[PDB]
Design a protein around this nucleic acid. Structure first.
Lengths: 67, 166, 116, 98, 422, 76, 163
RNA sequence: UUGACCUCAAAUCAGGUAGGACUACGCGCUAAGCGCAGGAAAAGAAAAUAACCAUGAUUCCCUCAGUAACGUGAAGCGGGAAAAGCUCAAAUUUGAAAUCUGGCAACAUUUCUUUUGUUGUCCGAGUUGUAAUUUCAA
RNA sequence: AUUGGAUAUGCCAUAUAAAGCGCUUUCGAAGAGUCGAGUUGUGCAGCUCUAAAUGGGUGGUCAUCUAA
């Protein structure tokens, strides 16, 4: 029972999500104008951050875009 | 929004606003049948907190009972027999005068698909809920038989329990 | 009226089969949930340790089991009980830790939509 | 081992814990919105016939008679004290604008 | 200096990132005995590095004893006002950036129902004011503080002058005294300060021209905006009474194409120093900061010093000035002029025409209403402004009751005053 | 003290239509009634229709819903 | 009987000309129909399906709970109360609440006229909180008329018992 | 002159539902009479106990205990069986009634050509409030 | 031949989404002809009166619950 549960975890081990066309262009457009380190200033922008995501949701988008 | 204002107004019942309305509405209620359909609850806040939703399947019925069992209990039962294809949800005092006590009864249509498909009121479709007022299973039925939790609230006594080894 | 106990052994058997039925359904996992250890509430019995209802929210926070995932692995949660002394907290935090030591939780299938 | 021991005893050493307050105990705390709503409705609905009698008795400095009416009306001295204090505040507020 | 100090790696790494790796005279005579655990009775001037003096040894003790939030608060720091406490809390956040000790601040005018919810989780580094801490000590069930080991008093002279004489005496009884390190700090050495030291510190302690403008509250910002526009090509430094107020004003002025620097930054001491050094280097520019942030910093050659918000310490402010001075004075606060008469300070009255005030209020209100981060900054700047006003030492001069809140919020960019508690 | 006396009306043996009295609304409240912070959602495009747009797009992709051009040309 | 002041204040409604002007401004900010809204969403949905920012709407606010929360938010610039709500308690406090919170209000004729504006059978009350910059003058002119023709008028009659 | 809403009506209009019988066990009103259910019913997640190192929905069994209380006659605790928790009302979705019954048209599906749904569209319900979120354990 | 809950796998998946837990210089609504009081009949019911907001209930100022 122990091994099959560990092996079954390995098979279903890709919890990480890919990005989509809308998400990728959203984060990329914010990145090109603000950089890849100043997420606080990214959040405070409203012209580009139309959905008004906070810096923590922008970081996940940036971190997720690489993979 | 305004349902908070409605409930604090309901607390003041001898007030000038409420006393005038109670006298006027008692007159119009007496001019109708003893049991008559209401288009909408006259106290929408009390109906709403007791379970009334403004959707198809829910029904409000106004009934008058001779003042001086509980009148509120008797209102539920008599409305239950009148609209016998409906389950009684709850009931609330609305008006009174020197002769009559007026109650409004919330009933649901168990055969209506909007009630049959709402998981929040689905529970009343089950046949165990036929005539909850007829069995003291409503709010005022439960209180009437002293059902509750505490120290304020028969086969077990008189029996002789004779065990197998004794 | 006399209550006669001729079905005392027929009740005993029926309860065993209900246990057997309950296992057959969820056989890799215990037929009963785990319980806390609590001290009875009187001067006569407060020196005993007995099974309680469920673990407190302070006990689960300290162990590491959030109140949502606690019930899903058969850990009851009593919101009413509390921890007036550190002895009860540490006695039952260790109980959850030992139970989690022996726990083999089997992975579930998780929806993985193709797009982002 | 994952098992429970039942009976016997445990270390009598005690270490008290200061538990925080439960949200259920917060009941009875007046709100800013509920205070506003109750004051509006107090004004709008008008006053009961017995509340008018009490306010006029307070107006003529008949406080002993006013408390006797309120206590007989509501049913307790505790309720009478609150009603007298509330209506006296109404009298002062009305007297400001009347 | 910092390298010579034996602070742990996390404290050392944070100190390098937070600020510099030097050690001032006040620190050099205070870190050693505080680290050893001996009682320290220092007397240092304002802005002499006192904040770090009682922080680095204290945080090191927290790491040394390995405190956890389930152990309650192990350190309490007492500050007289919110602005000084907030600066300390901001610095402490930088220092604890690498550690694992929870920190928190309890000050007057804040959310008591939420402050208590924070406390029952354990706040291993507590910054407080005497008024509110006593309330949380006597009236909050779930606040574990029996494991206290360090008590720090900041500016004890101001604490006793502001009216916390009895508040401290009550706090000492509730607070534990056995095996607890205490560190009093007050430049003044009055007899009452010595009495507090006797009742708190253990035996054998270680001893160590004016110009004003009368402007109504509603046009206060509009007058400022027009004045800054007129003097765009000069070196202007503006003092305010809240770090939240300066954040909004700098954010608002950057929005409308009036670039202004600030010492607020992001509560990062390195960024504030960088901004101040660049402003000193630049011959022209405009900077907004608070009195506390500018306290202890050498003011450069600046044409205009604008005191947009009343100062918290008029006794220190009159000696603070000793280009041209400015004072945005309200018609309800004309009594502050009488104080300068008592202090024997020369002054002149400045007048402005109502025609030249840039009436952009309708557009200014539309920006704040439309934008979200502007509205939150405006709301918080307005809240902190009032709370500082209600906490001023000069009750007879700056009466919050005599202040009109509708006009105040008009300056901040609100048609109607927001709902802030007191 | 008490004097154990008896009141003039002790049991031991008026403008019925007054004018409206403004003791509470005679003065206007300056500030909002709620101090609850403003949510970000009111300053952003609605997520209700974004949810609805996305499930309208899916039906357009799957052909369950006739597109505006196809429906308009079908009316001719 | 003798109607209380809080219930008699509804018999003195807004007059012909001002109500017609009020409803003229309201009809420029009617909400968007269910049939039209779908058409706007499928236009945007089709745009995003083939290949891919907007502006905040401007419509009159309705609903009893929604509007009462808008008055207490000091957001409503004009509140229009129907004069014939069947349980009168639903709006009996609205004039006094608007007086307390400094909002211009009026009691207009028929719920159906308010109901028509918002594509409903009946509306108990309507509130205008924000208008387009082009029509700021029109709302200001109407509010002045409501003050002059409804609040300045009557005034004493709402404190006297009716009937 | 027209229209909108409201209230009251009519129809052998469409779709439903109620009654009567059984009643060992259930729950009520007042053994009997009367009313109403199910495969169990009722009760049920504390406006509950306690005074302790505290306990922890309900029901049932043992014990408490023929004790206390005022011949009647328990209950807290303790041992066991079984264990499971939750839903609303009251806070603006307000940058969008996001909610739902029905008709019609397709499609799928069946203990089943008998069942049960899906999608699309149109009307109706609903802003005097249908969804989402929240239930104090927060 | 009818179906249970699982497992393996295929195809779809409206995720621009929805959660759990970190934190808070922000908030935190809680059920009335009811509770209660006076009096009659069998806790409940009748009738007269009729509330409150750290309030109300129930126990020994404290504890403990949070009704309608």
């Amino acid at each position: 029972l122990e091994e099959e549960a560990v092996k079954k975890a390995a098979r279903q081990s890709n919890k990480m999500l890919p990005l989509s066309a809308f998400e990728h262009a959203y984060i990329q457009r914010l990145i090109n104008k603000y950089g890849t380190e100043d997420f606080e200033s990214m959040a405070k922008d409203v012209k580009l951050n139309s959905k008004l995501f906070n810096g923590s949701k922008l970081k996940n988008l940036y971190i997720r875009m690489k993979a | 929004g305004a349902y908070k204002y409605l409930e604090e107004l309901a607390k003041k019942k001898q007030s000038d606003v409420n006393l005038f309305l109670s006298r006027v509405r008692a007159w119009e209620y007496r001019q109708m049948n003893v049991i008559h359909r209401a288009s909408r609850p006259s106290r929408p806040d009390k109906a709403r907190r007791l379970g009334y939703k403004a959707k198809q399947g829910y029904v409000i019925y106004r009934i008058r009972v001779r003042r001086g069992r509980s009148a509120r209990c008797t209102a539920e039962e008599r409305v239950g027999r009148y609209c016998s294809n409906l389950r009684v949800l709850n009931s609330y005092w609305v008006n009174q005068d020197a002769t009559y006590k007026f109650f409004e009864v919330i009933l649901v249509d168990p055969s209506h698909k909007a009630i049959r498909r709402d998981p929040r009121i689905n529970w009343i479709v089950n046949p165990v809920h036929k005539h909850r007022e007829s069995r003291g299973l409503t709010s005022i039925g439960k209180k009437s038989r002293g059902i509750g939790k505490g120290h304020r609230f028969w086969l077990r006594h008189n029996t002789l329990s004779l065990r197998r080894y004794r | 009226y006399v209550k006669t106990w001729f079905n005392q052994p027929g009740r005993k058997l029926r309860r065993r089969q209900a246990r057997q039925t309950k296992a057959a359904k969820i056989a890799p996992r215990p037929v009963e949930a785990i319980r806390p250890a609590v001290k009875p509430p009187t001067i006569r019995y407060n020196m005993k340790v007995r099974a309680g209802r469920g673990f407190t929210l302070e006990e689960l926070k300290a162990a590491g089991v959030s109140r949502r995932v606690a019930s899903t692995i058969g850990i009851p949660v009593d919101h009413r009980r509390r921890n007036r002394s550190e002895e009860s907290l540490q006695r039952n935090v260790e109980r959850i830790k030992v139970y989690l030591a022996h726990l083999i939780v089997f992975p579930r299938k998780a929806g993985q939509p193709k797009k982002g | 081992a994952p098992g429970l021991v039942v009976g016997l005893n445990k270390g009598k050493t005690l270490t008290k814990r200061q538990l925080p307050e439960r949200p259920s105990r917060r009941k009875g705390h007046l709100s800013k919105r509920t205070a506003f709503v109750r004051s509006i409705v107090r004004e709008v609905a008008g006053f009961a016939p017995y509340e008018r009698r009490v306010m006029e008795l307070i107006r003529n400095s008949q406080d002993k008679r006013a408390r006797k009416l309120a206590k007989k009306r509501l049913g307790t001295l505790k309720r009478a004290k609150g009603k007298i204090e509330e209506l006296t505040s109404v009298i002062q507020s009305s007297r400001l604008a009347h | 200096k910092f390298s010579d100090l034996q602070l742990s790696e996390n404290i050392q790494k944070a100190i390098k990132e937070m600020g510099f790796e030097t050690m001032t005279e006040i620190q050099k005579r205070s870190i050693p005995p505080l680290l050893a655990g001996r009682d320290v009775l220092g007397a240092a001037k304002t802005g002499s590095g006192k904040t770090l003096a009682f922080l680095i040894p204290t945080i090191e003790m927290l790491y040394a004893l390995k405190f956890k939030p389930r152990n309650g608060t192990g350190v309490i720091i007492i500050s007289p006002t919110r602005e000084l406490a907030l600066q300390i809390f901001g610095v402490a956040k930088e220092l604890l950036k690498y550690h694992h000790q929870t920190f928190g601040i309890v000050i007057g005018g804040a959310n008591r129902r939420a402050e208590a919810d924070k406390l029952v989780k354990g706040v291993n580094l507590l910054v407080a004011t005497p008024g509110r801490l006593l309330d949380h000590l006597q009236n909050t069930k779930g606040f574990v503080f029996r494991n206290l080991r360090s008590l720090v008093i900041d500016e004890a002279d101001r604490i006793l002058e502001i009216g916390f004489e009895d508040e401290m005496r009550q706090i000492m009884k509730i607070l534990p005294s056995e095996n607890r390190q205490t560190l009093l700090f007050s430049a003044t050495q009055t007899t009452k300060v010595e009495d507090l030291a006797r009742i708190s510190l253990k035996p054998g302690p270680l001893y160590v021209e004016q110009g004003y403008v009368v402007v109504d509250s509603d046009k206060r910002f509009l007058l400022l905006f027009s004045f800054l526009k007129r003097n765009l090509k000069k070196k202007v430094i503006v003092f305010m009474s809240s770090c939240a107020s300066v954040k909004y004003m700098a954010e608002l002025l950057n929005y409308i194409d009036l670039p202004v620097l600030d010492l607020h930054g992001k509560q990062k001491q390195q960024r504030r120093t960088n901004t101040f050094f660049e402003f000193c280097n630049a011959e022209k520019g405009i900077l907004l900061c608070t009195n506390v942030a500018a306290r202890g910093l050498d003011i450069p050659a600046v044409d205009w010093i604008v005191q947009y918000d009343p100062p918290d310490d008029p006794r220190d402010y009159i000696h603070r000035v000793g280009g041209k001075s400015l004072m945005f004075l309200a018609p309800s606060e004309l009594g502050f002029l009488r104080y300068l008469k008592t202090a024997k300070v020369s002054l002149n009255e400045f007048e402005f025409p109502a025609n030249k005030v840039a009436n952009v209020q309708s557009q200014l209100e539309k920006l704040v209403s439309k934008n979200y981060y502007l509205q939150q900054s405006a709301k918080d700047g307005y809240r902190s402004y009032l709370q500082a006003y209600a906490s001023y030492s000069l009750k007879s001069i700056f009466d919050i009751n005599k202040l009109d809140l509708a006009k105040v919020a008009k300056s901040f960019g609100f048609a109607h005053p927001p709902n802030v508690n007191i | 003290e008490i004097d154990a006396g008896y009141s003039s009306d002790s049991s031991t043996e008026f403008d019925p239509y007054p004018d409206y009295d403004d003791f509470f609304t005679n003065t206007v409240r300056e500030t909002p009634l709620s101090s609850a912070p403003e949510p970000k959602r009111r300053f952003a495009p609605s997520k209700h229709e974004q949810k609805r747009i996305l499930q309208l797009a899916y039906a357009i992709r799957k052909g369950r819903i006739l597109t505006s051009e196809q429906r308009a040309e079908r009316e001719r | 009987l003798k109607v209380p002041p809080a219930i008699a204040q509804f018999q003195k409604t807004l007059d012909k000309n001002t109500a017609t002007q009020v409803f003229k401004l309201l009809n420029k900010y009617r909400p968007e129909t269910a049939a039209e809204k779908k058409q706007r969403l499928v236009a945007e949905a089709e745009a995003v399906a083939n290949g891919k920012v907007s502006k905040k709407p401007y419509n009159v606010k309705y609903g009893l709970n929604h509007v009462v929360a808008l008055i207490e938010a000091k957001k409503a610039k004009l509140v229009l109360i129907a004069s014939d709500v069947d349980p009168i308690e639903l709006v009996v406090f609205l004039p006094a609440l608007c007086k307390k919170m400094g909002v211009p209000y009026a009691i207009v004729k028929n719920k159906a006229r308010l109901g028509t504006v918002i594509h409903q059978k009946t509306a108990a009350v309507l509130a205008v909180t924000e208008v387009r910059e082009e029509d700021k003058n029109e709302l200001a002119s109407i509010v002045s008329a409501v003050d002059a023709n409804f609040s300045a008028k009557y005034d004493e009659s709402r404190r006297k018992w009716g009937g």
